[PDB]
């Protein structure tokens, strides 16, 4: 089906506690495959998925150089942003950047992404045309002008349409037994009396990959959006994810409720009920 590659950079200043930390992690879909941390005893790009290990020393050296250079550049950028906002040298600040490429089920480039945030607020983003910028404010307008002057968009576009897709396609082939395998959720409904006249029905989805899933409750075939407690999808630690949806129902009315489950790994969408 569809696939993406993303790198996520986080650069965090910490005045009085050394120079800003730079961390980079790389993902294919919901699978992390590399990390780099400037605070590590000996900072180097390290593998985080078995299928990347087969890459040669040149790969690791090249990546490590890129991230070491980025460490320095992001420190400059933090200094620069502090200035753009007239901020004190006393506070900690964070730049985040995410970029990468999306492929459709045919392996074609669907779109590219390059987005940044400052202190968790959108700062600047490469537009879907991979040619123009959206700046959030007059500070980001300075970065925009700087990047417009240095032809940054053209460089990001070439990567996103080229290297990004080429390496994503390589990784997808090298890791095809996991990356191109959808594990369906194992699903069940639990029942927990809350009082004499109400009970919680909880619909569980366990052991699925990728993370994308839809879990809903219906009452008489109508969605219970407002009355459903839906927890955030959470990692199990073995690559898979877990989720549940719960509804409080009148005692005796349990069979009017249906849990509906959609996920890529399923031969067909599931309808479950509580089974006493």
């Amino acid at each position: 089906g569809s696939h993406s590659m993303r790198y996520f950079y986080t650069a965090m200043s910490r005045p009085g506690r050394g120079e800003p930390r730079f961390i980079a992690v790389g993902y294919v879909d919901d699978t992390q495959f590399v990390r780099f941390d400037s605070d590590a005893a000996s900072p180097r790009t390290e593998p985080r998925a078995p299928w990347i290990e087969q890459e040669g020393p040149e790969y690791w050296d090249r990546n490590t150089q890129i991230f070491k250079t980025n460490t320095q550049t992001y420190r400059e950028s933090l200094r620069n942003l502090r200035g753009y906002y007239n901020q004190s040298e006393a506070g900690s600040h964070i730049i985040q950047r995410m970029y990468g490429c999306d492929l459709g089920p045919d392996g074609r480039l669907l779109r590219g992404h390059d987005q940044s945030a400052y202190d968790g607020k959108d700062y600047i983003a490469l537009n879907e045309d991979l040619s123009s910028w959206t700046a959030a404010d007059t500070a980001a307008q300075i970065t925009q002008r700087k990047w417009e002057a240095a032809r940054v968009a053209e460089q990001r576009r070439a990567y996103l349409e080229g290297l990004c897709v080429e390496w994503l396609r390589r990784y997808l082939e090298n890791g095809k037994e996991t990356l191109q395998r959808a594990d369906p959720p194992k699903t069940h409904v639990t029942h927990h009396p809350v009082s004499d006249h109400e009970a919680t029905l909880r619909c569980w989805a366990l052991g699925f990959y990728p993370a994308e899933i839809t879990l809903t409750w219906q009452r008489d075939g109508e969605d219970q959006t407002q009355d459903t407690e839906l927890v955030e999808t959470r990692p199990a630690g073995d690559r898979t994810f877990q989720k549940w949806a719960a509804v409080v129902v009148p005692s005796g009315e349990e069979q009017r409720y249906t849990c509906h489950v959609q996920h890529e790994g399923l031969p067909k969408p599931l309808t479950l009920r509580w089974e006493p």
């Binding site: 790198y7 890129i66 550049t73 700087k146 990004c164």
Partner: peptide
């Protein structure tokens, strides 16, 4: 594979 160092443009 990440985006090449290129020219490193700082923000």
């Amino acid at each position: 594979e990440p985006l090449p160092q290129g020219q490193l443009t700082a923000y």
